[PDB]
Nucleic acid binder design. Sequence first.
RNA 1: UCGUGCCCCGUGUGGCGAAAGGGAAGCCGGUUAAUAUUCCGGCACCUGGAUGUGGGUUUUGCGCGGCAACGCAACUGAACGC
RNA 2: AGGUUGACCUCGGAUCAGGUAGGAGGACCCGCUGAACUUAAGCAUAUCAAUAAGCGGAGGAAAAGAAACCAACAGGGAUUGCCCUAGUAACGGCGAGUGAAGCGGCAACAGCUCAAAUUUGAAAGCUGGCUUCGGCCCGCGUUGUAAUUUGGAGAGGAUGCUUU
Lengths: 382, 122, 52, 202, 52
Amino acid sequence: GKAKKKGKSGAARNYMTRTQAVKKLQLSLPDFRKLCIWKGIYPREPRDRRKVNKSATASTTFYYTKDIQYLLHEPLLQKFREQKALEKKISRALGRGDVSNAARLERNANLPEKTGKPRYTLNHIIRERYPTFQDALRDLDDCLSMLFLFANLPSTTAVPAKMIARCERLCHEFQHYLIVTHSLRKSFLSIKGIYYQANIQGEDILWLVPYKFNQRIVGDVDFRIMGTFVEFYMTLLGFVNYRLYTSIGLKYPPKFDQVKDDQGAELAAFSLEGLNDPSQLFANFTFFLSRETPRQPLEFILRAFGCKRIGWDAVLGEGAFTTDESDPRITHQIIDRPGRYPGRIYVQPQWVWDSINDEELKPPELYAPGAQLPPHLSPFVK
Amino acid sequence: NGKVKAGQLWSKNKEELTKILGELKTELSQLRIQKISSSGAKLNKIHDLRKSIARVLTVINAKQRAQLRLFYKNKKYLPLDLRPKLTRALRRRLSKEDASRVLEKTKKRLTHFPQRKYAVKA
Amino acid sequence: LSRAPKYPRKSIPHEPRLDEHKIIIHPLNTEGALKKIEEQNTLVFIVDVKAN
Amino acid sequence: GALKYLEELSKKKQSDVVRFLLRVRCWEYRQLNVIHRASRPSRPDKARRLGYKAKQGYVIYRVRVRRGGRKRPVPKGATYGKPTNQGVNQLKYQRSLRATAEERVGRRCSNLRVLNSYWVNQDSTYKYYEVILVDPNHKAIRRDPRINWICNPVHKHRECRGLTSTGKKSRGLNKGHRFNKTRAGRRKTWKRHNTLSLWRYR
Amino acid sequence: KWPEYIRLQRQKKILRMRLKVPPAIAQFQYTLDKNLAAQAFKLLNKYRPETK
RNA sequence: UCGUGCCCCGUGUGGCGAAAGGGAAGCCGGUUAAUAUUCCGGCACCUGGAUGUGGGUUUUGCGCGGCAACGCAACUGAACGC
RNA sequence: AGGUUGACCUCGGAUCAGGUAGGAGGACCCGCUGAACUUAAGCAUAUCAAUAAGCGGAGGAAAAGAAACCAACAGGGAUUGCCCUAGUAACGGCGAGUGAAGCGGCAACAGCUCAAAUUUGAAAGCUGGCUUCGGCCCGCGUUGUAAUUUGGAGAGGAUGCUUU
């Protein structure tokens, strides 16, 4: 019938640029990028970008029109608008000098610095993004690497200290689940960090944890969108931890002792309670970790592979089985320094990783202090 | 055949009612096709099928509206078709309580000096 | 802002006005149609005037 | 109360302060549109004594109307019947420019009810009025027994029937010997006087 | 070419400066200075009315 | 990234109004009782969209030839202008 | 940070949340506007007629209505309608004509609400949203929303009984 006009169909209708998407959603750029990261809207590339927009360049970002249409019905848009209006009310109250009204309006803002949680709730987004717990377990690699990396940073404006503490607490709860289920399988010491591989419900989960040192935040990364990733991943890991604890029939969240955490218990601040073979490799031994040894990976690995009596120095933290080094019940001692009590096996830390990787107890004479260590092989590469 | 009583339809629920509407429309179509080519009792059977379709649609609509009234029983705003009709002037009329509101002075006067019951001797 | 009404104006969505049983009424049984059946492999129907 | 002081101040319309205020307000209202909403009444004491309240549902609309006489809309302004001994320049409208302003404001806001109106300023070309309007559909209005009489359907368009103050003034609804022809309705009284009554046993 | 409301408010301010203002209105141009206003509000901020 | 903004531009304003004005593109043969540049057979065209193949161009990055008029199957071209 | 951060006022936008108006009918009702034929010997006052036509706006009735009234009495006492006043008072080219009201008898009867006051020892008032239906919020509002007062009075006192 009537002749069609050029550019009214095809890739021009299919794709949308970032500027057009922002103007269509009537959002700001930080809110748009945050929503795209949270909802999984990924950049796309047309075959010919001039057919979509004549002013587009090689740095132009294209999205799907149907993806923006789906973003139009997200309930977090009204949350953004209500939070902006609430902030305007708080500014008005502070400018008029009503401090009580300002505090009362501020307590409804749900600030991450005072809650430890994300500002905007992503619970409905979690079910949309992960229809199945298997998909959640498959994205747990990225989630665990992300949260274990941000467990050890100083507080910033994007990611506050209470949010970092919640990251560390969720990671500790996941580690406690792995310990009580003996799901940890392999570990590796690389030049970048410590690789951990576990098996949860038939799914292999591999993640990387940095060595406990001062981590450098460089300007080459987008730290605020990394913090948005952190918020999404803690929202995922909370429900993952809840489902795993309910499946093993334990109460969630676990009882957490603030006094012990204050004294430095770390993993020892949690007490797990009930609701209402390589796993016993270190069951009969008693370990003593010296202060120059990596306490959190050593404790996690030993407790996951069956050790029940681990002590350490008093500066390593509260919750040790014993503190004095002269305890006669100690069987093995981990030292890494360049006066040996009798009836005790002194080995370097690499003995623990080698023993858990080969599922057998290594000869201690090859791991004697001051000796040349055997090479540390990768347990993942056959 | 083709005559479906409303008493049977009032006990069915949604999906089998939609199904039976499907077959009733179906043999409506094919008995129109045999109507244009022959004659007999099909000319009464098509009327029976049409009335059966009307009954099924009526029952489905009535059950849907009853469910919607049950859902909107305790809400402030109702759909306009579920709102009472009355007339336009009756809908724009003042409510009974707003019409019966009185001032505080009038309330005091009616409380302490109402219309009394009395009689006069002859 | 887009509309976020507190109640739907119409409680029940309308059933589709033109379904297949209303589109197709009856085939044509004339000499032209009954020739076209074997001449052109074409079936002739009487349909609704609104259907495309 | 300050409204007593505003009353005695508004009585003195030829004082320097009131003349200056009237001049600047005349300029402002002439620069504004012919009919426009006023955010608040410019004469709060006059509005309050005429019935305005600071309550949701009460609005004020300001309006200017061209003043002078009324011209009959005949072509070339000339009548071709029997001679009338006068021109169309001296024909007078039987209602007030205040009533005309009230009707125009009511047509602008047909959903509301005109309560009353008052003169605010004037010049050679226009007269300026402010009209108080009440929302009959507002819950705060409908719950008040002092004002919910205006929610009844008998009070639709009082300004179009002459039920306002200027309407009663134009209709001459006053008791006495001076208002014999108009106190109960002029055309009704004329029909009553010119009807012929014939009883059965006459 | 400013909008009519901006033009109206600016020309209204200009007109009130151009015309001769009677003393009863012109006396409002002389107000408290910054220090005395600050001290007055410092005293009056202790005596705000009771909240809800 | 002071993350909740900034930059560019001026021309205004919408609709109806022509089966003879302007306009993207279909011809031939056959066929009915009555329709046909509309149906059937053959042979085409226009508009719009997506995306392949061949060919073209390119390591002298965006063709070559003719003095020239210009030619050749291609042979980048946004804003803003003529 | 002060070239900043805000509070107000005014004016806008939104397929924002919830509503409202248009048109019909128009016998009767409330207004606007408004003739001529006719009757005056003819005819510009007049009469028809403050009518027909035209325009705007309501309801089962509408309108009016509780005196800036009538009166001049030994005073009556909101409005409306009937009878009477009364073809009277009065108006009117060159006269054809026009024309009320008070009282009186009856029908039916019904009274009231604001503005002008400081609650100031406590905006006590209200729209909307969410509700676990207890309430909690966003607000409107002191340039005034509640209680009290309306000329018949009332406000302040004194006093001793009654009413819900």
